[PDB]
């Protein structure tokens, strides 16, 4: 409603770096807000795509940002009569970024890994890796839980059970308020998908450079399964956290699985031990129900609510014809220990191939009326197909069915305006929470400041 679409702030990165693929707000130790931006196709030292991360200070003018530097050199270690190998070419550093406290977690879902022992090998596979940084102190650390040293022959004998070679860890990410990093890995367990959790503080204390393979005892991974309903389900494509079991000492995890059960798609709510509390099933096949998940209390009853994006949902229309527009599902949490029922509200796109629901960002309370609000992206929507971001306001019964404000892309065609979103943070310190929108196709980020209500 009260975002300012006239005076925007534009940050920009190198041409072809996909600057804006991921973003988040980062507060330093003094509470000063900045913007962390991922660019998964930034060039490295060898003039080869490796990805990169930028830390943008808040300026109303915008402009260029300084790099948040990471090691981009392929590593090699000959230990234990084996040879460990990391490969950072086309790893996609910055395909997901997230901030917690004064720490930044940027991930390279496609960092490759291989282990050589004489003539055998573990196979060169994308285990992924996340780089952690404390910008004020310069501390650095890494976390790659799916790295293994088991040779290729062994996996074949055991029928590819507990195969973490293609995790792509860091594909999606989130950090609990307590400081436990949770990585979605949609390729883990031979493309079933797994989650990996570990406290940030233990990642730093247990990491040393050049080791490549090290233990993090406090870490916790999800479990493999022989159920074909999970096969090729990409469990971990998106991740989120919230309070869904009425126990405030426990933290619950929300996981998207957009090809679960033969591309029906699903979202599951679990405890910190990966025991399934509830499962939302997709409405339509190939709709990619689970592509994005968001957790926020929209109806102001203190109980978190769930939002699921199905960006390829095909709405039924006249003459038995379908039209791919995208859809968002809202689930309100019931009072006390009870199952989440049917969706409370269905938001359906309008523009063909617009992918309404590709990203869903909690905004906090935008108009300051006591109800938290959200923003939904349609990166190829709008009458021109350049992209749109729609704002839906909270209310006592859930969300409003019609948007309060529509942000049309200020970028050219193909910018993927809205592919990444992030809100609920007041960056200019005017009392109103603001919205940052990524457009990796144009290598830019647009900042929308919220202003008093008119």
């Amino acid at each position, epitope marked *: 409603l009260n975002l300012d679409p006239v005076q925007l702030t534009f940050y920009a990165g190198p041409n072809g770096s996909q600057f804006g693929f991921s973003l988040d707000f980062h507060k330093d130790s003094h509470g000063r807000v900045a913007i962390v931006v991922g660019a998964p196709r930034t060039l490295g030292p060898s003039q080869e795509e490796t990805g990169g991360v930028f830390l943008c200070p808040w300026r109303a003018e915008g402009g260029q940002c300084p790099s948040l530097l990471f090691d981009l050199r392929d590593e090699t*270690r*000959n*230990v*234990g*009569s084996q040879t460990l190998q990391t490969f950072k070419a086309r790893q996609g550093l910055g395909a997901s970024v997230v901030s917690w406290s004064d720490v930044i977690v940027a991930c390279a879902p496609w960092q490759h890994w291989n282990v050589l022992e004489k003539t055998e090998e573990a196979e060169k596979t994308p285990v992924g890796s996340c780089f952690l940084a404390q910008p004020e102190s310069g501390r650095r650390a890494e976390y790659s839980p799916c790295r293994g*040293n088991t040779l290729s022959r062994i996996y074949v004998e055991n029928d590819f059970s507990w195969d973490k070679r293609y995790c792509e860890a860091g594909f999606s990410s989130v950090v609990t308020q307590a400081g436990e990093l949770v990585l979605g890995a949609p390729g883990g367990y031979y493309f079933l998908g797994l989650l990996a959790q570990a406290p940030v503080a233990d990642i730093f204390s*247990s990491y*040393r450079p*050049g*080791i490549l*393979l*090290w*233990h993090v*005892s406090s870490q916790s991974l999800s479990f493999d399964s022989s159920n074909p309903e999970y096969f090729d389900g990409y469990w971990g494509y998106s991740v989120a956290v919230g309070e869904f079991d009425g126990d405030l000492n426990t933290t619950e995890y929300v996981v998207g699985a957009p090809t679960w059960s033969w591309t029906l798609g699903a979202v599951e709510i679990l405890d910190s031990y990966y025991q399934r509390l509830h499962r939302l099933r997709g409405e339509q096949m190939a709709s990619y129900f689970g592509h994005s998940v968001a957790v926020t209390d929209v109806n102001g009853d203190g109980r978190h609510d769930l939002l699921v994006g199905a960006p390829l949902y095909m709405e039924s229309r006249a003459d038995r014809k379908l039209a791919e527009v995208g859809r968002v599902y809202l689930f309100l949490q019931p009072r006390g220990p009870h199952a989440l029922g049917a969706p409370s509200l269905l938001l359906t796109g309008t523009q063909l191939y617009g992918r309404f629901g590709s990203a869903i960002a909690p905004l906090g309370d935008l108009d300051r009326d006591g109800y938290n609000d959200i923003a939904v992206a349609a990166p190829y929507g709008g009458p021109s197909g350049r992209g749109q971001v729609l704002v839906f306001l909270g209310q006592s019964e859930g969300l409003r069915s019609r948007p309060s404000q529509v942000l049309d892309s200020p970028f050219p065609t193909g910018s993927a305006f809205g592919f990444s979103l992030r809100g609920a943070v007041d960056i200019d310190d005017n009392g109103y929470p603001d919205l940052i929108v990524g457009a990796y196709g144009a290598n830019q980020v647009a900042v929308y400041r919220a202003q008093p209500v008119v």
Partner: antibody
Amino acid sequence: EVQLQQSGAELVKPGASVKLSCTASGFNIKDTYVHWVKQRPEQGLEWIGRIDPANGYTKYDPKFQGKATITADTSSNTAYLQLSSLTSEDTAVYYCVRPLYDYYAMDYWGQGTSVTVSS
Amino acid sequence: DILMTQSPSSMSVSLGDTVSITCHASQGISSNIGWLQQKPGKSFMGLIYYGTNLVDGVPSRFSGSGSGADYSLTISSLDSEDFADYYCVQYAQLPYTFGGGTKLEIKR
């Protein structure tokens, strides 16, 4: 805290067999590699072998191929070292070892099991 | 197998001295070496791993260094507890092999 609690000292005769144990305390034995080391005053320290208790796969020094047999039961959270056809040279102290962070290191050590072979 | 030549076999030193133990390998091991301490009539405690990294709980007066096939363990300002046995161990290749050992003795 990480502590490795081994069995009590053994006193056996030559030709017989003995099975030492190494119980994990404060952690799961399945987490890391578990090595066995042999110590003697003259010969010093010698590496026997290792086992991954998550799957049971083992590696050995070719010198101990035959006498040493390393196993692990995740249920009782314990790792074992069996020695067969015992000899006066098998009189030594035996330590089970695990690493701290590095997958291939030797950082945490049990108190050690004293073995004495004699007729 | 890789031979670990540890030297010296023993040294007589006093409290507060800065001493250095060395360990030479038959081939390059690229910092895949650890250091160990065995106090008299007791078990082993890890000091260093990967050539330089301290084990948790170890004081900072200890320090490891070296590269290729020649490494070192240094103790700045000896304490009364530091008089004990010290061993190096390489884990670059299987089988793991240890050094002969070094015993720090009180000088008088």
